[PDB]
Design an enzyme around this catalytic site. Structure first.
Site, PDB file in Angstrom:
ATOM      1  CB  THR A 106     -23.547  -0.724 -18.251  1.00  0.00           C
ATOM      2  OG1 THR A 106     -25.045  -1.226 -18.785  1.00  0.00           O
ATOM      3  CG2 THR A 106     -23.301  -1.390 -17.031  1.00  0.00           C
ATOM      4  CB  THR A 107     -20.731   3.460 -15.503  1.00  0.00           C
ATOM      5  OG1 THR A 107     -21.007   4.140 -16.829  1.00  0.00           O
ATOM      6  CG2 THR A 107     -19.409   3.850 -14.892  1.00  0.00           C
TER       7      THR A 107
END
Lengths: 228, 219, 195, 225, 233, 194, 203, 218, 60, 193, 60
Positions: F1-2
């Site tokens: 996840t970013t």
């Protein structure tokens, strides 16, 4: 006033609850040779549901007179306690245990300051030591055993009649109901008519059964035969 | 008002409970060493009402018996707590409760409701009695007071029977108790039955002897 | 620790070792392993010193309060039951405690062995502690209910001495007690080196 | 002295009857007229709903559904009925959680009556000032502030309970015809010309209880004329 | 309830709490008892309330042991004193538990005084009742000196050389100015206390209607009817 | 996840990826990680999916409550503080949030995993943030315009999506300004097919 | 482990107008068969039955709880309890202990008030599945299920149902170590039920 | 045990297989995996069968009280919030994953709810063993659809799960919730056809009875 | 919780002594290589594997 | 581990338990009374952890006495056994008692003999063998027990079972207490094997 | 190594049967939420703490 002694040593609320009981529908009980009669008089007419006599265990039935809401509350309480007893010991309790449950709760309510007594009385039909028994509980919580008793409207008259004119003879339950109807007619002629409101239980510790209007009229045939 | 003093200095509600505990069928008892005898006034001129036994056992092994005068429903509660006290004490300590300890705990239980704003005092004089090693009779007042009694009477007309019993010449406890009860009862209106509590045994005294005894005082 | 208590015709004998250790280090050699709670009731602590001493002094207060309430001496059965219940309330929490509550109920001697597991046994002869097994051997050979008072005391005195002679976790002084119908009496604090 | 929160507000009088309970019954009997009519094949429940304020009669309801088979309507204090309705919904959902079936009317009425009777013995509490008509399972129960219940064939609660029950008593029969009868009689009992907005109707027939929509109520009126 | 709690706590226009003023009347309604404290002994004599001679004389005892070398005498409502005695025994046991010693008598008096007026509390183990106790106590004991203390229902206490409580309290007080000298022996002082008790007690004084407690450095003696007879004759 | 938040000229710009991994399996590939707290406050959730949702469901009602209790626009600071207490009071809840909004000035608050709250000018989070710390450090510029910040977020999240296996899909972006919030969409096909 | 400590298995087959309820009369203490006469099937009425497999104490206490609730319900209602209602109530009772579940599996058999056969089963926490053909529980549940699927056919007569279910139960117990040696079969039908006891292997 | 939910222009399609398993043994051949929550909301589930029924029953209770009290059609978001608030406190010990879909005032919504209390609005999902087989079909075939195409895609998705998962079932249940109402198709397809085999019969003499007690219902 | 204090003192052991020891809170002449608790050589400073799936290793 | 063997015949029940109290390595006492006679019609023995066993037995005895005196409950082996079961079950999942019982006595239905195991499992049977006797004595009981045994035959069978334990079990047993409950009362027999 | 095959079939137990059983290499109808072995809900997506010091936590 609430639940507190008066200068005469009397709990006024308990006495007023006992007075209220007299306003309820008439209920009678009688111990006979082979069982116990439980009789109730409904103000309205209803056959689709029984309202004056109820079951607690296979061993105990109760009649009701007085505040219907409180009576049903404590009927449910007594049934729940009977089932708790069966859960605990794996057998149904006798009349004495139901009497004890209801009397304990009633006494708690006539002793608590911030609550009012239950305005109803029960008659318990049951057996103990293989002999039929007939108890009773007042709003005060006192337990009285009886050969026969009455509560509700005309309770004083019917009770005095049971004390005075009953034959004092051990007899079959049929004869017991016959005598009960005779005394009811004697003390009030309204009992010679309008029997669609009557509930009669022929309590036997295992074979208990209710009586229908045909049985009641067949009994009244005996009074028709005798009075004439 | 509950749990409060009146302007006079009285616990008014406790005295009303005392008076309620007086307005009850008279119980008369008399004790000598190794035996106790007591008699109960009953109202069974009404034949449909079945008399209830007023002498109930608190512990069969300890031979402790309980009787009362006053509000009958409260008697059930007090007797239940007495039996519970005996059983709980045996569970906690593994030994039988002593009679004096049972009397103390029952009187403390009675006092509990006298100190409570929410509850109404027990309106019953209760008698604890035991004949195991020696005869001992405790009379517990509704307020929580209690003390051993050689002989006495409780109920509506306890004062007259107490006066009759006090410093009497007779020493037969059966005669003592039966005659003491006979002085006030309205015979054929309220009748007399009596029991003899002996060493780990109990017996009814039969009505004929009771009648021939009370003939001297109720006539 | 090695503790010893038993009943014989003349009365009752109690003996303890009076050593206390923390691992290999001997912290003390004069620890008193007997709680006197009244003239007719004593308790022989064994195990965690703080644990047994605390509950025994807590039991000694219950006996004192009982005496005030009833104007009567507490029975051994009730004194030990109070102690047994207190440790039982902490069963499974690692509490380590073993004791004999010795005393007379009137004319009768009784010793109740109590331990942290909630156990409570009445008997005529108990030995508790690391050296108990050695004490049991010496007692089994020579213990008799028909012992005279002098024989019983020497048997208890000697039985503890042997246990101390062979066990690491004991061997202070041999505290010796004799409890009779008329009460207990502290009969000595014999040093095991001077036998 | 200031108000005692621990006071028992319901007590027996020297005449051997509860004082506050009769006042609660009086409060309940002053409510809007609502009637029920058992039939040989169903039950009809109708309730007049007044519009003394700018109430949206289309959105405001007088007959409520407890479960798929039970319905309910009241005469008396609106807030007390709302609390009793929450309580009865809890009862019904608890029964359905346990047994998975729709609560039978008798069991529901018993539990409901106990839970409302608890207020005739609760310290510092007054009884609910509402009379309740419960329709379901081809039955009808009227519940009294005391917590006493009675099964009825034709029932009435509200101010016009002095006269309203006549045509119900005298014209019991087919459900659809009985709907027309028990909706026709109400005109003589309402204080103004009854529009379909001013009346709400709920009918138990077959397996379930359904509250007629304003369109159905309009149709029921059209059926007369 | 809040209303009853307020009724307990209401002050009078004169100040002093109404309930305390009523407990003041309550504490007077009891049998007489005298406490005498001297350099080496403290005595406590109380008249027994034998309501009927059928009541067991030994069972109506009036002095309670609250701990080793502390005894409690009382006047007024007898029912209340049971709870006070139990609470005092608990306090003394707890004090020994914490400190392994017999408590100073004034320590028990302060504890009881603190508990007395906490009746407004809701918690149960730090109050005596929901009201003042209808009894007046003469608590005697030995800690390092013969101590005589009087605790009244107002919650206050005072250390006394001599005091009398009960219906005959005032008469005995007016008599103490003359009949009391702290310099006499235990036996002569006990004879004096018995005479003072007899001078106000209802019936004739004897060894069975009298209870004597004498606490000294050596023993917390309670005299049996034989010793009371020896001192009466 | 970013997830990342960058404060540009008079505004807040937050970007995130869509992939919601589950082991090696992408449980979903359209998950919205820009959770709206209020019309002017947005938060990017990182940590347990269940716990971070629980927090954002709660502080959603707290910011409104306090907003109407004192009659003022919802405050990012109060939202961040409200999140910090829950994340701190309940260590069992594995949650870390970037709360960014615009009450009176743009502001970014980073509630770290253990409840450590820090105000920041730009912030990144999630598993894929590890691979763009150098890129964000060198490429960030104070007071960017919208186009500059949009490119900056576009470049940073794109390079995190490539390297991080838990980061993938299109880049959801939302720019919170005084005049409201407008969403953007950098389609994954443009990223992947590049 | 605790379920197979006591062992035992249940089988319920539905025919037409009849349901056969079978259980083994073995009580275990691990390998040792403590009793050969332990019935695991309880009868609230001649039309409501249910048996338990798993911890025996849990089964007995659940039976007493179920009887309490059923008696209260029957007192509160004008009609007897439907077997579907009984199974739902049992499932509710099981799920109230979700965090400390009973180690039992329940089969509920009976006749509906309209006199049709009914059978159902549920796991430790009341995951209930009403069955139209058959349902099994206990140690031999695998063998019972396989042989019932092989042999069961719909609408089998009362006596054919009895014979088929008995054969399946015997042959499933013969392949189960804790399968018991004494067996009981309640042949349930709208007129009542028949408690039949038969024997198989003697080891 | 494959579950599938597909959202289309004006409703949701929720499909499921009809198999329950306990180990390698099929426990229920035609279990109904679609749970009622409201006339406009249905919920499937994977995981502990008891937890699916009770969690979906709690939502049904709360949504029934809500619609009965406030007389408005319940929201799908209300159902998911109720489930989330119930599942989260237990930290997933109540192992219930749901596919909640429905149509309300705001349109058609479809949610995935997981045992730990997380939710996710979605356009299409699968749950349970065989979701990977199902999601492969949904990935390839999903687009903007009507109920006809949505029904086909969801059923094709379940079929893939049935055919490729050991623990996926035989039949396909289907439910469509649209603005026009709810419609159910139990055993919509029967891909797992069984063989027809004769009925084996024992002789009546093959069994022996030792004792027989006969009881009467009254 | 109670620490089993005195178990070795209370039982014959067929080291919980009577008094609590400070240890409750090897025969080799070993010194510490660094003051740090259990570190004696440089850390393995590579890039450490995270994520993926160790629960399903073979689902490449 | 603690062994007890009980069997019932016509109008009598035999319960035999080893009287020795012992732990893993030590025999604390060799003659301990492990029976409770609630009333002369019912006798039950407690086994297992002595601390739990005697405590639960005392609680059960006092509860049964209280229920008999206050509530007039009929004390029978079934009622006693149900009380044991409830007491053990209530604590099973919160404070498990490591003890098990063996209740026997006469009721209006004749002799009854109940075994309440560690988990509260209650079951009636013609003969019981708890503790190690479950693994050694069931063969002997099967071989020897028959419905029409006499009281002396029952005592002899109990002796045979405990002799099997004496000869084969590794743990030492020396004393057994047998209490025969019958219409004559309760008869106590002490044997040294 | 040998697997104790037959211990239960060899000893009275005061499940290793005589024959080895399959899958030697709960009472709840559980089933699975995903075909992945242990996965039930989305992965915990955050930057995970590594390095620093765990055996010297208080030497900041």
């Amino acid at each position: 006033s609430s639940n507190t002694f008066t200068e005469e040593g009397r709990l006024l609320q308990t006495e007023y609850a006992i007075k209220n009981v007299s306003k309820g529908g008439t209920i009678i009980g009688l111990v006979c040779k082979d069982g116990v009669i439980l009789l109730g008089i409904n103000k309205t007419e209803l056959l689709d549901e029984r309202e004056k006599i109820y079951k607690i265990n296979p061993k105990v039935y109760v009649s009701v007179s007085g505040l219907f809401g409180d009576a049903m509350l404590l009927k449910k309480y007594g049934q729940v306690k009977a089932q708790d007893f069966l859960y605990e010991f794996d057998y149904d309790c006798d009349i004495d245990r139901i009497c004890n449950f209801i009397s304990e709760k009633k006494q708690l309510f006539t002793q608590y300051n911030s609550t009012r007594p239950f305005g109803f009385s029960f008659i318990y039909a049951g057996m103990k030591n293989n002999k039929f028994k007939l108890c009773s509980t007042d709003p005060s919580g006192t337990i009285n055993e009886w050969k026969g008793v009455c509560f509700g409207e005309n309770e004083d008259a019917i009770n005095n009649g049971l004390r005075n004119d009953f034959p004092d003879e051990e007899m079959d339950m049929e004869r017991g109901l016959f005598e009960i109807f005779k005394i009811l007619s004697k003390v009030t002629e309204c009992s010679a008519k309008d029997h669609k409101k009557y509930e009669i239980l022929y309590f036997k510790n295992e074979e208990s059964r209710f009586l229908e209007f045909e049985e009641i009229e067949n009994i009244l045939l005996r009074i028709e035969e005798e009075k004439n | 008002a509950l749990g409060i003093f009146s302007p006079d200095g009285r616990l008014i509600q406790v005295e009303y409970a005392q008076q309620a505990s007086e307005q009850g069928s008279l119980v008369v008892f008399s004790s000598d060493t190794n035996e106790i005898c007591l008699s109960i006034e009953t109202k069974t001129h009404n034949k449909m009402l079945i008399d209830q036994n007023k002498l109930l056992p608190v512990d069969k092994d300890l031979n402790i018996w309980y009787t009362f005068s006053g509000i009958k429903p409260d008697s059930y509660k007090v007797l239940n707590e007495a039996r519970l006290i005996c059983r709980n004490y045996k569970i906690k300590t593994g030994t039988n409760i002593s009679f004096d300890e049972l009397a103390y705990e029952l009187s403390l239980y009675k006092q509990k409701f006298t100190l409570d704003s929410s509850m109404r005092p027990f309106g019953i004089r209760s008698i604890l009695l035991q004949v195991k090693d020696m005869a001992k009779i405790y009379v517990l007042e509704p307020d929580g007071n209690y003390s051993e009694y050689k002989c006495g009477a409780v109920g509506q007309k306890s004062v007259s029977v107490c006066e009759y019993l006090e410093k009497c010449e007779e020493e037969d406890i059966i005669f003592r108790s039966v005659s003491g009860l006979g002085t006030v009862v309205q015979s054929d209106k309220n009748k007399v039955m009596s029991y003899v509590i002996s060493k780990d045994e109990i017996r009814r005294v039969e009505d004929e002897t009771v009648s021939q005894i009370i003939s001297t005082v109720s006539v | 620790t090695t503790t010893l208590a038993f009943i014989f015709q003349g009365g009752m004998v109690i003996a303890v070792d009076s050593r206390a250790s923390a691992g290999s280090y001997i912290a003390s050699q004069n620890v008193h392993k007997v709680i006197r709670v009244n003239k007719h009731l004593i308790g022989t602590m064994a195990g965690g010193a703080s644990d047994c001493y605390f509950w025994e002094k807590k039991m000694g207060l219950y006996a004192k309060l009982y005496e005030l309430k009833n104007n009567k001496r507490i029975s051994v059965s009730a004194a030990s039951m109070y102690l047994s219940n207190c440790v039982y309330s902490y069963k499974g929490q690692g509490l380590s405690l073993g004791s004999m509550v010795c005393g007379y109920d009137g004319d009768k001697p009784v010793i109740y062995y109590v331990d942290d597991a909630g156990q409570r046994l009445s008997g005529d002869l108990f030995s508790v502690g690391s050296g108990s097994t050695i004490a049991y051997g010496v007692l089994n050979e020579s213990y008799r209910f028909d012992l005279t008072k002098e024989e019983a005391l020497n048997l208890g005195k000697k039985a503890i001495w042997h246990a101390t002679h062979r066990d690491a976790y004991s061997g202070g002084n041999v505290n010796l007690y004799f409890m009779d119908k008329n009460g207990w009496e502290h009969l000595g604090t014999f040093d095991v080196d001077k036998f | 002295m200031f108000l005692d929160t621990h006071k028992q507000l319901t007590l027996f009088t020297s005449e051997g009857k509860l004082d506050q309970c009769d006042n609660a019954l009086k409060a309940a009997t002053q409510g809007s007229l609502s009637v029920g009519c058992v039939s040989e094949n169903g039950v009809v429940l109708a309730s007049l709903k007044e519009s003394n304020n700018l109430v949206i009669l289309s959105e405001y309801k007088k007959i409520y559904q407890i479960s798929p088979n039970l319905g309910i309507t009241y005469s008396g204090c609106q807030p007390d009925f709302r609390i009793q309705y929450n309580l009865s919904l809890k009862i019904s959902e608890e029964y359905t959680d346990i047994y998975s079936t729709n609560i039978p009317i008798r069991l529901f009425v018993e539990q409901f009556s106990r839970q409302i009777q608890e207020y005739t013995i609760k310290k510092g509490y007054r009884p609910f000032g509402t009379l309740l008509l419960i329709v379901g399972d081809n039955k009808m129960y009227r519940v009294d502030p005391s917590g006493s219940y009675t099964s009825l064939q034709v029932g009435t609660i509200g101010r016009e309970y002095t006269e309203s029950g006549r045509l119900l008593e005298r014209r019991k029969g087919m459900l659809d015809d009985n709907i027309s009868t028990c909706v026709e009689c109400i005109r003589e009992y309402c204080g103004r010309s009854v529009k379909s907005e001013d009346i709400d109707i709920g009918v138990y027939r077959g397996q379930e209880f359904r509250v007629y929509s304003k369109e159905e109520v309009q149709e029921v009126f059209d059926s007369i004329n | 309830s809040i209303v009853s709690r307020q009724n307990a706590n209401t002050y009078s226009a004169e100040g002093r709490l109404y309930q305390v003023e009523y407990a003041m009347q309550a504490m007077n309604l009891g049998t007489s008892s005298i406490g005498i404290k001297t350099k080496d002994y403290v005595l406590l004599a109380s008249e027994k309330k034998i309501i009927s001679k059928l009541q067991n004389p030994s069972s109506v005892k009036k002095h309670y042991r609250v701990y080793d070398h502390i005894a409690l005498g009382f006047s007024g409502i007898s029912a209340d004193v049971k709870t006070i005695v139990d609470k005092s025994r608990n306090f003394a046991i707890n004090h020994e538990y914490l400190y392994d010693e017999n408590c100073k008598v004034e320590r028990l008096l302060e504890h009881l005084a603190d508990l007395s007026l906490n009746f407004d509390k809701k918690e149960a183990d730090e109050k005596i009742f929901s009201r003042p106790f209808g009894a007046s106590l003469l608590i005697i004991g030995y800690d390092t000196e013969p101590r005589l203390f009087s605790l009244d229902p107002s919650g206050s206490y005072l250390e006394y050389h001599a005091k009398a409580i009960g219906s005959g309290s005032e008469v005995i007080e007016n008599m103490l100015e003359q009949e009391f000298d702290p310099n006499v022996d235990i036996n002569s002082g006990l004879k004096n206390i018995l005479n003072m008790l007899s001078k106000v007690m209802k019936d004739k004084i004897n060894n069975f209607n009298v209870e004597i407690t004498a606490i000294t450095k050596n023993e917390c003696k309670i005299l049996t009817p034989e010793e009371i007879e020896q001192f009466l004759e | 996840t970013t997830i990342m938040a960058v404060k540009y000229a008079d505004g807040i710009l937050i970007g995130a990826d869509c992939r919601t991994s589950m082991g090696t399996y992408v449980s979903s590939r359209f998950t919205d990680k820009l959770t709206k707290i209020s019309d002017n406050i947005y938060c990017c959730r990182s940590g347990s999916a269940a716990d971070t949702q629980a927090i954002t469901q709660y502080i959603t009602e707290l910011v409104q409550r306090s907003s109407f209790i004192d009659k003022e626009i919802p405050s990012v600071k109060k939202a961040a503080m409200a999140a910090k207490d829950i994340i701190y009071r309940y260590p069992n809840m594995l949650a870390g949030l970037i709360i960014a909004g615009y009450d009176t000035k743009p502001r970014i608050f980073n509630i770290s995993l253990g409840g450590t709250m820090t105000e920041a000018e730009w912030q990144i989070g999630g598993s894929g943030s590890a691979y763009i710390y150098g890129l964000c450090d060198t490429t960030f510029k104070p007071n960017m315009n919208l186009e500059e910040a949009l490119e900056f977020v576009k470049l940073a999240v794109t390079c995190a999506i490539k390297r991080d296996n838990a980061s993938g899909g299109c880049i959801r972006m939302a720019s919170i300004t005084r005049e409201g919030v407008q969403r953007f969409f950098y389609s994954g096909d443009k990223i992947l097919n590049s | 482990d605790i379920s197979q400590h006591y062992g035992g298995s249940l089988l319920a087959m539905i025919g037409k107008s009849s349901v056969a309820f079978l259980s083994d009369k073995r009580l275990g203490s691990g390998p040792i068969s403590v009793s050969k006469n332990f019935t695991k099937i309880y009868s609230l009425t001649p039309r409501l039955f249910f048996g338990f497999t798993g911890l025996v104490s849990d089964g007995e206490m659940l039976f007493k709880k179920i009887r309490k609730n059923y008696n209260l319900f029957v007192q509160d209602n004008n009609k007897d309890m439907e077997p579907s209602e009984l199974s739902n109530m049992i499932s509710y009772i099981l799920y109230q202990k979700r965090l400390q579940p009973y180690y039992v599996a329940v089969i509920v058999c009976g006749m509906t008030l309209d006199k049709k056969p009914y059978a159902s089963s549920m796991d430790c926490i009341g995951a209930m599945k009403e069955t139209s053909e058959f349902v099994t529980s206990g140690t031999a549940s695998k063998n019972l299920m396989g042989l019932s699927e092989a042999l069961f056919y719909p609408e089998m007569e009362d006596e054919d149902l009895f014979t088929t279910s008995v054969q399946t139960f015997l042959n499933s117990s013969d392949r189960d170590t804790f399968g018991g040696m004494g067996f009981e079969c309640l042949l349930i039908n709208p007129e009542g039920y028949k408690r039949r006891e038969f024997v198989g292997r003697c080891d | 045990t494959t579950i599938v939910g597909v959202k289309y222009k004006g409703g949701v399609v929720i499909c499921a297989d009809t198999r329950s398993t306990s180990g390698p043994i099929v426990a229920d051949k035609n279990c109904s995996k679609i749970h009622y929550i409201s006339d406009n909301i249905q919920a499937c589930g994977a995981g502990t069968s008891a937890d699916i029924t009770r969690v979906t029953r709690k939502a049904s209770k709360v949504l029934s009280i809500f619609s009965k009290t406030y007389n408005r059609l319940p929201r799908v978001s209300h159902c998911v919030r109720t489930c989330q608030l119930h599942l989260h406190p237990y930290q997933g010990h109540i192992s219930a994953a749901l596919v909640v879909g429905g149509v309300d005032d705001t349109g058609a919504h479809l949610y995935d709810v997981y045992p730990h209390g997380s939710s996710n609005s979605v356009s299409y999902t699968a749950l349970g063993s065989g979701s990977l087989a199902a999601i492969s079909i949904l990935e390839a075939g999903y687009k903007d659809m009507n109920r006809e195409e949505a029904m086909e895609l969801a059923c094709a998705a379940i079929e893939a799960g049935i055919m490729n998962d050991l623990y996926s079932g035989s039949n396909i249940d289907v439910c469509v919730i649209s603005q026009e109402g709810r419609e159910m198709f139990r055993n919509y397809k029967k891909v797992g056809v069984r063989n027809e085999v004769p009925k084996f019969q024992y002789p009546r003499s093959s069994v022996k009875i030792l004792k027989e007690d006969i009881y009467k219902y009254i | 919780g109670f620490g089993n204090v005195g178990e070795d003192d209370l039982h014959p052991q067929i080291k919980k002594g009577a008094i609590f020891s400070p240890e409750e809170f090897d025969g080799i002449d070993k010194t510490d290589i660094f003051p740090l608790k259990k570190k004696r050589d440089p850390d393995s400073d590579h890039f450490k594997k995270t994520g993926g799936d160790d629960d399903n290793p073979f689902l490449y | 581990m603690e062994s007890s063997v009980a069997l019932k015949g016509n109008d009598f029940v035999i319960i035999g338990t080893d009287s020795s109290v012992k732990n893993s390595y030590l025999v604390l006492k060799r003659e301990e009374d492990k029976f409770y006679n609630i009333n002369n019609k019912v006798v039950f023995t407690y086994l297992g952890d002595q601390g739990d066993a005697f405590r639960t037995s005392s609680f059960i005895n006092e509860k049964l006495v209280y229920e008999e005196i206050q509530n007039n409950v009929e004390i029978t082996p079934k009622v006693t056994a149900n009380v044991i079961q409830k007491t053990l079950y209530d604590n099973l999942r919160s404070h498990p008692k490591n003890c098990y019982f063996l209740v026997g006595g006469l009721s209006q239905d004749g002799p009854e003999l109940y075994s309440v195991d560690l988990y509260g499992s209650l079951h009636e049977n013609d003969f019981m063998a708890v503790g190690i006797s479950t693994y050694f004595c069931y063969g002997v009981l099967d071989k020897e027990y028959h419905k029409n045994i006499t009281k002396e035959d029952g005592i002899k069978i109990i002796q045979k079972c405990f002799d099997v334990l004496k000869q084969r079990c590794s743990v030492d047993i020396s004393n057994i207490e047998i209490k025969i409950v019958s219409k004559e009362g309760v008869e106590t027999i002490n044997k040294v094997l």
